[PDB]
């Protein structure tokens, strides 16, 4: 029970202010902004070098802080961005086009509903992960039990099996047959049900169907693998 906005400002402080003097995370942020790097690896030893109690909070509550770190770095990218990305990937072209059209029709003073927004993971194009603290002792798969749920464990074992990289949905995208507005459905469950009707303002106002169709093209996927360690 801590003020997550306060902790968000603190993780911003750590990301901006850390050095070793070369600003490790600053340079990684520049590389992120240029899209020369698709995943960032935070080092909890580096976190604890200044704020060990922050590392304590992360370890006792990891996934929350995965989300908070991701959001903070998303917010911090434009500060370090120097030059326009070269639009390497079709996904990057999609995010650039969506940013273009939302800035076009923004009406900057105007206020919009929370759901009339781009899902926060749809625009990232960077992953954030943790490298566990050396202070933590590597556990054993029998010992890791219910009291470790939601916590950042460190474990060692032999990888006995792994599936091949399959694409996994993270934000399904849909298009109406009426209003010409994309729709987005985030994903948290292993499975999901796909939408049918359109929640776009124009479709609801005109009281037309707007039976949106799922698009594999404008959606986001992430590489997905599963391994059985022991």
């Amino acid at each position: 029970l801590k003020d997550y906005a306060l902790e968000k400002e603190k993780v911003k402080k750590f990301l901006q202010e850390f050095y070793q003097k070369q600003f490790k995370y600053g340079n990684q942020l520049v590389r992120l902004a240029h899209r020369e790097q698709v995943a960032l690896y935070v080092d909890l030893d580096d976190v604890a070098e200044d704020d060990p109690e922050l590392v304590d909070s992360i370890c006792e509550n990891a996934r929350r802080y995965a989300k908070l770190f991701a959001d903070a770095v998303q917010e911090l990218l434009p500060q370090y961005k120097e030059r326009e990305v070269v639009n390497k990937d079709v996904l990057d072209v999609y995010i650039e086009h969506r940013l273009m059209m939302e800035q076009r029709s923004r009406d900057p003073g105007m206020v919009r509903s929370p759901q009339n927004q781009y899902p926060a993971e749809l625009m990232r194009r960077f992953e954030l992960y943790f490298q566990g603290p050396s202070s933590n002792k590597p556990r054993v798969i029998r010992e890791v039990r219910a009291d470790s749920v939601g916590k950042l464990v460190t474990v060692r074992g032999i990888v006995t099996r792994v599936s091949e990289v399959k694409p996994k949905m993270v934000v399904a995208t849909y298009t109406c047959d009426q209003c010409g507005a994309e729709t987005y459905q985030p994903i948290q469950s292993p499975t999901f049900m796909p939408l049918i009707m359109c929640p776009s303002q124009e479709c609801q106002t005109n009281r037309s169907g707007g039976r949106l169709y799922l698009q594999t093209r404008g959606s986001r996927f992430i590489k997905f693998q599963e391994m059985k360690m022991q």
Binding site: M193, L195, I196, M197, Q204, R207, S208, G209, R211
Partner: protein
């Protein structure tokens, strides 16, 4: 259920098989093992749950939406719109069925079925003497020698008369033949001749 004739196979291909529906009066005419020509439509019979991937689906074109608390989403939504996959499968609809290699253009019944030309042909065949060696030669023009095998296999094709006792013992009528010999002595060749 019918499958591709052995002549029409492509290279490395399993014989495809498709299901043929036989409506009234053309119904018991086909039988298992025959070589039948079929004539009729190619229709499509609806299939459902043939694939684990979503495919083509029908739905009404009415522009209804869903009120709050009854919103046309999920299972309620699909039932309301009447969504249904359209997965089909070819199923031939045989209008008629004939043998692909008919025996006749149609003992007394078969004799009536005989045309005049074939009847006189088999008549002079029966009246022929040396029909023994003639049948040997006709069955096995390729073979040389092996006259005993020729004779035995011919008699096998004609067969004996099955009989049965008053008590109920089924006296055999068929006559089984065995060819045993050194390798490459036309044994499998004789069997192939009988097959073909």
């Amino acid at each position: 259920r019918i499958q591709e004739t052995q002549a029409e196979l492509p290279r490395g291909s399993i014989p495809r098989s498709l299901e043929v529906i036989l409506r009234a009066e053309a119904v018991e005419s086909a039988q298992a093992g025959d070589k039948c020509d079929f004539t009729g439509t190619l229709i499509v019979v609806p299939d459902v749950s043939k694939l684990s991937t979503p495919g083509a689906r029908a739905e009404t074109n009415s522009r209804v939406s869903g009120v709050d608390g009854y919103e046309t989403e999920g299972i309620r939504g699909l039932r309301a719109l009447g969504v249904r996959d359209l997965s089909y499968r070819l199923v031939f609809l045989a209008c008629c069925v004939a043998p692909t290699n008919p025996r006749f253009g149609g003992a007394e019944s078969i004799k009536n079925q005989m045309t005049v030309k074939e009847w006189e042909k088999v008549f002079e065949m029966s009246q022929d003497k040396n029909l023994y060696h003639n049948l040997c030669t006709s069955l096995f023009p390729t073979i040389h020698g092996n006259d005993e095998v020729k004779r035995g296999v011919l008699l096998m094709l004609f067969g004996g008369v099955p009989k049965t006792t008053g008590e109920g013992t089924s006296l055999r009528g068929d006559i089984n033949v065995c060819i045993v010999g050194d390798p490459s002595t036309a044994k499998s060749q004789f069997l192939k001749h009988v097959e073909e």
